[PDB]
Amino acid sequence: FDHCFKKSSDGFLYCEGTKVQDIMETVEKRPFYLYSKPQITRNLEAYKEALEGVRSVIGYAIKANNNLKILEHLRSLGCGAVLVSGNELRLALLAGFDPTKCIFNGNGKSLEDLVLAAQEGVFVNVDSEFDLNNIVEASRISGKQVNVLLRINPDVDQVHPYVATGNKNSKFGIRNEKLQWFLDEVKAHPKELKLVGAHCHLGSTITKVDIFRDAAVLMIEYIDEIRRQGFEVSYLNIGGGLGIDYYHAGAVLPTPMDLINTVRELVLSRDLNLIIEPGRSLIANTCCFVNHVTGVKTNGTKNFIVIDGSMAELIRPSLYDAYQHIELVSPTPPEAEVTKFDVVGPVCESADFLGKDRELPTPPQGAGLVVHDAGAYCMSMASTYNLKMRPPEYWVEEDGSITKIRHAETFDDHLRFFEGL
Amino acid sequence: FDHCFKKSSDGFLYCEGTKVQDIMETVEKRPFYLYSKPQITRNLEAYKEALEGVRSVIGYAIKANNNLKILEHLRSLGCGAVLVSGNELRLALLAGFDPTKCIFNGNGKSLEDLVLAAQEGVFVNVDSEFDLNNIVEASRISGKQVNVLLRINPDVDPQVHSKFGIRNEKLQWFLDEVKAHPKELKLVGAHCHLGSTITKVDIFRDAAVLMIEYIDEIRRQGFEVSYLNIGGGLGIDYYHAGAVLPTPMDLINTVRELVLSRDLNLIIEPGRSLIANTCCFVNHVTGVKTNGTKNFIVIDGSMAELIRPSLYDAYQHIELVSPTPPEAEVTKFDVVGPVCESADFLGKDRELPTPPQGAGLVVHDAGAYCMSMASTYNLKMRPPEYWVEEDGSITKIRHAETFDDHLRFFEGL
Ligand SMILES: Cc1ncc(COP(=O)(O)O)c(C[NH2+]CCCC[C@H](N)C(=O)O)c1O
């Protein structure tokens, strides 16, 4: 297993060379998210090495994790920013992203947000007829021409239905039979639009690189037709959606190299800039959600590890029936009875669980427990549900040092919303 | 059909005689949750009326909605508070709630939260052996006796695996463990939780009948038991199909005479039934698109402000706020937000007229487990909250979250 979070022979969990027990003891006894900064570097360098010889933008999907320190680090390594909202663009500019490496996607881009997009000069995809009319009005208000990409549905349908974005009947991209309508409209707005490319995103947790190859071939047919109607196209955006190993049992998964190798010769043969939009595959595997065990109990013949963390800070398992690996931070006295636990949070409800049916040694009270691979769509999807206030974030750097990269939310951060009313 | 949000003859949606269209013009052009403060009042008065002549606590789940102004209004009317965390307890005390009308539930009550619970004189429902030991240690740290209730398990489990019952083997152990800790624990009653949505009043009656036999035996064994906490909500008509639903009167009519015969104080938990149908999530239509077989109304609101339909497969009624132009196509729509995954939907297969851009659209019955679960996914910052008063006036009960709120987490880091 290649992974930044490793259980020594001793039975201690480490993040790089630092013992998680040790960090747990130097921080507030409430849940926290812990990152390896080095694993962030390693994840980008795999894509950068994969894209050698291809003119390319690596678009970090900011939706996956919006920690300002993490954006600042990805941006220093030459990363681009993919953006689904105006606040995401705003954060991308404070992080110091180059606007000509930013791409603004979405199926409901507001006029106020398209105006910011236009004045800053970012790429803007085109998802619908109403989107186009909005991007046109945005250009008028901003007085800047807008580099657009047609987001096109390739009609390519094997992934959780809540993260399937390329399929027939998703809310994403234009109709295929209506491509000509978009090309005619763009040519009718030479002041306001400059068509520079085609965009697709197929979904998330994809583990089958064939679907990227089959997609890229359909996208090159459309770029070839667009080029022949006299449009100057520089860019193909195949998006993100590359999966990672959530199961921690040595599974061999498609690398960034495997993914680029499927479209390398087709892209090079058309002298296209490739835009990739990885979120999960850049950030997910760099991070544990660190909990304390509260107690252990039994309803009839299921068994329960009750932890301080919950669906408030980490909703992915409940929301998608997703597996994230669970294991203890410190070694157990070996007279404990290894049996099958459901791992649940302090909220009394059936959706408040972080994993089901997990063979583990019975933990003592106050024992560290982690959920692995919680760098993506975990903190970013977090609520204050049951007033479990959002956790702090720490990372481990090259030198073995521990730095807080996000203040913990307090109960006072809830009262701020009612001051003076 | 009967509701605080009604379409009139003029084809406009009203909230206690105020047009939602005129409210939308007063507030910022972004999604917002809108409540009828009077429907909150009616819903509570219905329980209060059903509980008259019965010693009782109407226990409101702060879990379902933790707006301070709404907590203070429910407290002003004699409402109790059901708590699942330290912070919810801190907030019940701020909102002026009576600690003799607070109960603290949960499978993971931290030691530190129980200390606060013990200092403040709130009831504690006991979940497990590790919960009891936690409670005793909370007593020794606080220096305060903790009033506790023991679990009773009814017949509800659809799964199928001393003088009580085959499903209540451990209760005697719990009584003896409580008797062994007199300075630290005082048993004051018995709790149990039924299905999330009670449809049949008979399931309440039967749970009550069972727990009264247990409390009789608990009283025979030398304990001073005063309280019966039967947690369970009545159903909400989420389809506005005008269905058959039992009223609070019908429910409490089933236990009234047995509870009076024993002089028990009945703690009911109607949190959902109290706030759910008082509230609309109000949106602006961004635009209408189509992909193959499906049509979409795209709104400004999202799974970031309202995850319930995505997370629980949940139907909530949707309709436009104002009349449509005559030419507008009536046709099936999914209603979706702008967040970049297919989980971001508020409703599916909804026969609506085709809204113009900027048109008001509501998701109904967004009172419970909606704002309380809001996130900042896609940095969609959390919406402000408004209510209509008795007089028809519009008052803000929560400030909108701003981007600088996200930025404050990184200050000096
Ligand atoms: C247009 C667009 N580009 C890139 C991405 C990033 O995808 P990934 O992180 O590389 O997989 C997206 C993302 N979209 C939706 C996926 C939701 C995931 C869900 N919260 C989960 O399973 O946790 C995109 O839309």
Say whether A168 and B292 touch across the interface (CB within 8 A): yes
Domain of A319: which CATH number? 2.40.37.10
- Give the span between the Cα atoms of A412 and A415, in whole angstroms: 5
Find out whether B198 and B204 touch, Cβ atoms under 8 Å. yes
Q: Which of A204, A244, A316, A377 to mutate to test the pocket of ligand 1 (most atoms within 8 A of CB)?
A: A204
Find out whether B292 and B270 touch, Cβ atoms under 8 Å. no
Write the single-letter amino acid at B259: V
Shared-domain flag, residues B257 and B329: no
Residue A283 CA, closest ligand 1 atom number = 9
* Segments forming the whole domain that contains residue B237: 37-271
Residue A241 CA, closest ligand 1 atom number = 11
Shared-domain flag, residues A3 and A107: no
List, by residue number, the catalytic residues of B: 340
Long-range contacts of A89-96 (CB under 8 A, 24+ apart): A89/A113, A89/A116, A89/A117, A89/A120, A89/A122, A90/A116, A90/B403, A91/A62, A91/A66, A91/B379, A91/B403, A91/B406, A92/A62, A93/A120, A94/A68, A94/B407, A95/A68, A95/A71, A96/A72
Domain of B47: which CATH number? 3.20.20.10
| CA A203 – ligand 1 centroid, Å | 7
Method used to obtain the model = X-ray
| CA B64 – ligand 1 centroid, Å | 29
Binding-site annotation, residues of B: 233, 269-272, 308, 312, 341, 369
Domain count of the fold of chain B: 2
- Give the span between the Cα atoms of B27 and A32, in whole angstroms: 37
Angle at alpha carbon of residue A70, lines to A55 and A111, rounded to 5°: 70
Residue of B nearest to A89 (CA): B379
Shared-domain flag, residues B201 and B62: yes
SS (HEC) of chain B: CCCCEEECCCCCEEECCEEHHHHHHHCCCCCEEEEEHHHHHHHHHHHHHHCCCCCEEEEEECCCCCCHHHHHHHHHCCCEEEECCHHHHHHHHHCCCCHHHEEECCCCCCHHHHHHHHHHCCEEECCCHHHHHHHHHHHHHHCCCEEEEEECCCCCCCCCCCCCCCCCCCHHHHHHHHHCCCCCEEEEEEEEEEEEEECCHHHHHHHHHHHHHHHHHHHHCCCCCCEEEEEEEECCCCCCCCCCCCCHHHHHHCCHHHHHHHCCEEEEECHHHHHHHHEEEEEEEEEEEEECCEEEEEECCCCCCCCHHHHHCCCCCEEECCCCCCCCCEEEEEEECCCCCCCCEEEEEEEEECCCCCCEEEECCCCCCCHHHCECHHHCCCCCEEEECCCCCEEEEECCCCHHHHHHHHCCC
Backbone φ/ψ region at A203: left (φ over 0), alpha (ψ -120 to 50), beta? left
Name every chain B residue with its beta carbon within 8 A of the beta carbon of A87.
379-381, 403, 406
Name every chain A residue with its beta carbon within 8 A of the beta carbon of B165.
none
Shared-domain flag, residues B305 and B156: no
Name every chain B residue with its beta carbon within 8 A of the beta carbon of A129.
289
Residue of A nearest to B88 (CA): A387
Q: For residue A342, give the 3-state DSSP assignment.
A: strand
Using alpha carbons only, how large is chain A's radius of gyration in Å? 23
Q: Which of A63, A74, A103, A318 to mutate to test the pocket of ligand 1 (most atoms within 8 A of CB)?
A: A63
DSSP alpha helix (H) spans, A178-273? 179-187, 210-228, 256-261, 264-269
| CA B304 – ligand 1 centroid, Å | 15
- Give the span between the Cα atoms of A88 and A63, in whole angstroms: 8
| CA A58 – ligand 1 centroid, Å | 14
Q: How far apart are the first and last CA of chain B?
A: 54
Say whether B398 and A416 touch across the interface (CB within 8 A): no
B96–chain A nearest CA distance, Å: 15
Nearest CA to ligand 1 atom 25: B340
Name every chain B residue with its beta carbon within 8 A of the beta carbon of A131.
287, 289
Residue of A nearest to B304 (CA): A381
Say whether B69 and A175 touch across the interface (CB within 8 A): no
| CA A160 – ligand 1 centroid, Å | 12
CB-based pocket (< 6 A), ligand 1: A 61, 63-64, 82, 105, 163, 165, 201, 204, 239-242, 277-281, 316, 320, 376-377; B 340-341
Pairs of residues, one from chain A and one from chain B, whose beta carbons lie less than 8 Å apart? 227
* Residue of A132, A171, A175 to mutate for B, most B C-beta atoms under 10 A: A171
Distance of CA B43 to the CA centre of its chain: 13
Find out whether A34 and A23 touch, Cβ atoms under 8 Å. yes
The strand pairing partners of B6, in sequence order, are B14
Say whether A414 and B307 touch across the interface (CB within 8 A): no
**Listing from the earlier edge strand, what are the strands of the sheet with B18-19?**
B5-7, B13-15, B18-19
Shared-domain flag, residues A236 and A384: no
- Of A279, A314, A329, which closes a domain? A279
For the four alpha carbons of B412, A420, B371 and B106, in that order, the dihedral sign comes to: positive
Shared-domain flag, residues B44 and B130: yes
Query: CB-CB: which of B130, B287, B342 is closest to A164?
Result: B342
Say whether A386 and B88 touch across the interface (CB within 8 A): yes
- Give the span between the Cα atoms of B190 and B174, in whole angstroms: 12
Nearest CA to ligand 1 atom 5: A240
Q: For residue A418, give the 3-state DSSP assignment.
A: helix
Shared-domain flag, residues B52 and B89: yes
Shared-domain flag, residues B312 and B334: yes
- Of A279, A299, A323, which closes a domain? A279
Nearest CA to ligand 1 atom 23: A377
Shared-domain flag, residues A159 and A284: no
Distance of CA A271 to the CA centre of its chain: 29
Query: CB-CB: which of B90, B291, B411 is closest to A171?
Result: B291
What are the φ/ψ torsions at residue A292 (nearest 5 degrees)? -115, 140
Shared-domain flag, residues B63 and B208: yes
Name every chain A residue with its beta carbon within 8 A of the beta carbon of B161.
300-301
Q: Would you state the torsion angle of the CA atoms of residues B192, B194, B197, B201, taken in this order, to the nearest 10 degrees?
A: -100
- Of B218, B250, B271, which closes a domain? B271
B150–chain A nearest CA distance, Å: 15
Name every chain A residue with its beta carbon within 8 A of the beta carbon of B87.
387-389, 411, 414
Query: CB-CB: which of A297, A365, A404 is closest to B413?
Result: A404
Residue of A nearest to B400 (CA): A417
A269–chain B nearest CA distance, Å: 31
What are the φ/ψ torsions at residue A81 (nearest 5 degrees)? -120, 120
Query: CB-CB: which of A106, A163, A306 is closest to B108?
Result: A306
Shared-domain flag, residues A351 and A260: no
Write the single-letter amino acid at B88: E
Shared-domain flag, residues B266 and B281: no
